Amino acid sequence: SMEQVAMELRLTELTRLLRSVLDQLQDKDPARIFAQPVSLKEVPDYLDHIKHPMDFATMRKRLEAQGYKNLHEFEEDFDLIIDNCMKYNARDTVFYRAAVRLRDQGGVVLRQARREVDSIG
16 A cells, blocks of 8 residues: 555654664763673673663664664663663663763753654654
């Protein structure tokens, strides 16, 4: 149907806007602490702690499969990255600290993306 196509074009445009968001968020992690999944070989107890692991490579795979229907879903995943880290790691750690910086610096990016998503429809 012509409609299914229109819908598809919109998803594809949403995916374009979210790719730009993802890149901007990932620039705010210059140490690449959040770039990849936590290794179960190196942290064999991790899944006892964190039930829904997330990281930027995993978000990127979903994104390129157009698996984010809306910005809420994308933000859910980003918030997992931060929230998982602030639980597993203590306050005095470079990991917790990187999470706090990423959350703070990302807020600005996510503020404007919401406005753009609502504006362009």
